[PDB]
Amino acid sequence: QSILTQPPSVSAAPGQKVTISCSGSSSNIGNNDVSWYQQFPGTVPKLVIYENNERPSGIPDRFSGSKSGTSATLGITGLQTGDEADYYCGTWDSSLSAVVFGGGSKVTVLGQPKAAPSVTLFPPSSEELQANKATLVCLISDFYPGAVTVAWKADSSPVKAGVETTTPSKQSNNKYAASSYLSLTPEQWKSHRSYSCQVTHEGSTVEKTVAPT
């Protein structure tokens, strides 16, 4: 429910141009300068445009901005893979006497080579079982783009409870990682022939299995 409105996402291939709109009203964009911020996953935002169309010293000239009436636009010409990030517009709102941000727009650079996830599945440790608990640990790394679906099975049946999965996090090598945990009672663990963690990424699945034996 941001005061300023931006498209949830924009996509294009390298070398192309992408534009992100930001709509408001007379009280904000219409009578105040707009700024744009770039934010890579897990990093602090960076100012890329201010005073509607000015680039802070150091920002590549492929970044541009404009404002006409009550709406503004951020443009990125000659799109590079290194431009994949979230972008936010912001401005002062005279009716609220406060700075207001748009909801943000995700810029995706299409056509990049995909990377399948590396999956490691650990069974409950003897120590945990001796504590009357059981946790299966599914570690997923080095995948790109950063989106996966994690499903668990007891034998061949879907497990719909006791699962906790993190959202993907960006690694230092720009690929992504995530982890999924399955909580079970020691009896459940020992009762089935096996349990599996299935990781689906870009249409294909990598599955690891472990067994009480």
Binding site: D33, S35, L47, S97, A98, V100, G104, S125, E164
Partner: protein, 218 residues
């Protein structure tokens, strides 16, 4: 130019928190300061601002009456006071500045590193550490499971920091119980399993607890 904020805060619902932001400059009158927060996977939200030189302060409607922004010129420190904490106030809080000399003054080109503020009914709890005992292409994977702790953060090192290549410590998951869990895994040459000792060093300062867990092959 640098802005350094205070450490992570953990609060119970209804309590209050105070976060600080220290500027590297000689005075605060040369800049306008803003406080912006961002919840996990959500957008940036401007909360308040202060322009020391003018003794002026502004607040987003959403936070009026609950937030107060102050400035201490003698120590070049800016503060954010948030009262009546709600679980949904959980987020990373940033202070940002803009050089001047309110829309004509507020802008955010320099950002602090951020301060996490966790608001939960959960109580401090040290983690239970379990070994994840050791394989593909001559390499084996071993690790440590750091289960049910509160609050963040937990740091993990291996062999007192001597082992770093092949180490991957995963971000914690916040369970439906309000407790956190995370894991750290190291990929090592299988041949090393018969000699090299592997110990994960888990540190949970919130509980003044450190666990060194030996991980041996099954």
């Amino acid at each position: 130019v640098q802005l350094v904020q205070s450490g992570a805060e953990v609060n119970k619902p209804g309590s209050s928190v105070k976060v600080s932001c220290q500027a590297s400059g000689a005075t605060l009158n040369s800049h306008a300061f803003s406080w912006v927060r961002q919840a996990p996977g959500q957008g940036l939200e401007w909360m308040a601002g202060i322009i020391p030189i003018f003794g002026s302060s502004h607040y987003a409607q959403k936070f009026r009456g609950r937030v107060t922004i102050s400035a201490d010129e003698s120590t070049r420190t800016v503060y954010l006071h948030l009262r009546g904490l709600r679980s949904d106030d959980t987020a990373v809080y940033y202070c940002a500045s803009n050089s001047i000399a309110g829309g004509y003054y507020y802008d955010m080109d320099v950002w602090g590193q951020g301060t996490t503020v966790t608001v939960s009914s959960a109580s401090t709890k040290g983690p239970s550490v379990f070994p994840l005992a050791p394989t593909s292409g001559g390499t084996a994977a071993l690790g440590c499971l750091v289960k049910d702790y509160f609050p963040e953060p937990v740091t993990v090192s291996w062999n007192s920091g001597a082992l770093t290549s092949g180490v991957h410590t995963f971000p914690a998951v916040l369970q439906s119980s309000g407790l956190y869990s995370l894991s750290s895994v190291v990929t090592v040459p299988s041949s090393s399993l018969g000699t090299q000792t592997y110990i994960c060093n888990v540190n949970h300062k919130p509980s003044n607890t450190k666990v060194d867990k030996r991980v041996e092959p099954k």
